Design a protein around this ligand. Structure first.
Ligand SMILES: O=C(NO)c1ccccc1
Ligand SMILES: [K+]
Ligand SMILES: [K+]
Ligand SMILES: [Zn+2]
Length: 357
């Protein structure tokens, strides 16, 4: 079995003109790539080439108006870029942002194509800017286009429309864009774990609560696991996977698994406030590898401690390569609210998933 890896240093060109120390740093991706080299993981992977997504591919999930305005920022003056970024929630734009977002999406398309054509068993995508906050019609939360959602639709376009895609979003923030894009869809199962705090945590919407189970044909196909009042870590994430993520995913029987793999729930992240360990992410990855005949694509989302995201993502790649999972630390008893959260989700989704009854 072969593991693919995509990375292109061009994606570092997206930058914040006013605040060069903004945490969504160019060196997020080069630091992760460097750690793969340092651990001698890179030579064990097959390098998958980056490419630019096309405008037609962006239209799989995004409106013509949104594509057009982000496209136009490549030739904007600094004042145009500042004003346009400030129309969105938490966005900065440079003349390179559009091209970098194209590269992130196209890198994942090539990785999904390599998996689906049997060239690699699984793959990891070291990409920026991130994607999961991006909506059909708007940018949000450092994201311009929804890379993971586009990759799911791209996968469907080269296989069949009803190809069952599971998106597991373990970034510490809710993937509002991914939820909304697939909310009426039963071919793409969205599962998000996220710090919620009764709606107070970014992106600050009650859409992220456990009772949002999907709409219409998609009822039952949106699973929110929201955390409140606790510094969650490996025990709570392992419990959520045991009781919720893996039973539902097994019943759904995905043909492709995409991981919206933010590493901002990691110990040491300056924003997330959680303490998931690199070994914890390794165990989450190893569990997902038991789905979809191993067809797993890990897509970088958030995560802002450069050392933390480098250790965490490289251990996920180690798991994809077949290495034995490392031992976890001593697990503390589940924080009270985390049991409450899991039980709340169980009650919400027992109507739709017989494995939860
Ligand atoms: O990491 C984030 N989303 O994944 C994020 C963090 C702070 C503000 C906006 C977005
Ligand atoms: K999430
Ligand atoms: K869905
Ligand atoms: Zn995040």
């Amino acid at each position: 079995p072969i593991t693919g890896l995509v990375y292109d240093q061009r994606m570092m060109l997206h930058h914040n003109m006013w605040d060069s120390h903004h945490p969504e740093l160019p060196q997020r991706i080069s630091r992760i790539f460097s750690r793969h080299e340092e651990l001698r993981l890179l030579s064990r992977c097959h390098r998958i080439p980056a490419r630019l997504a096309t405008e037609e591919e962006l239209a799989l999930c995004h409106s013509s108006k949104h594509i057009s305005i982000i496209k136009s920022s490549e030739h904007m003056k600094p004042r145009d870029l500042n004003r346009l970024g400030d129309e969105y929630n938490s966005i900065f734009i440079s003349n390179e942002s559009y091209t970098c977002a194209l590269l992130a999406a196209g890198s994942c398309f090539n990785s999904a194509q390599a998996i689906l054509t049997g060239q690699v068993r699984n793959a990891v995508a070291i990409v920026r800017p991130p994607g999961h906050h991006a909506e059909k019609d708007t940018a949000c939360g450092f994201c311009f286009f929804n890379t993971a959602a586009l990759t799911a639709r791209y996968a469907q376009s080269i296989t069949r429309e009803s190809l069952r895609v599971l998106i597991v979003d373990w970034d510490v923030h809710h993937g509002n864009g991914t939820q909304h894009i697939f909310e009426e869809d039963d071919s793409v199962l969205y599962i998000s774990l996220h710090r919620y705090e009764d709606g107070a945590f970014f992106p600050n919407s009650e859409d992220a609560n456990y009772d949002k189970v999907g709409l219409g044909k998609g009822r039952g196909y949106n699973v929110n696991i929201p955390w409140n009042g606790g510094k969650m870590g490996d025990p709570e994430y392992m419990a959520a996977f045991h009781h919720l993520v893996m039973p539902i995913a097994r019943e759904f029987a995905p043909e492709l698994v995409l991981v919206s793999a933010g590493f901002d729930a990691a110990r040491g992240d300056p924003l997330g406030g959680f303490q998931v360990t690199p070994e914890g992410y390794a165990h989450l990855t190893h569990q997902l590898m038991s789905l979809a005949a191993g067809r797993v694509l890990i897509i970088l989302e958030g995560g802002y401690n450069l050392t933390s995201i480098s250790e965490s993502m490289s251990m996920c790649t180690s798991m994809l390569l077949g290495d034995s999972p490392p031992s976890l630390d001593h697990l503390t008893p589940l924080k009270t609210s985390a049991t409450v959260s899991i039980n709340n989700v169980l009650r919400a989704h027992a109507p739709f998933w017989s494995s939860l009854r």
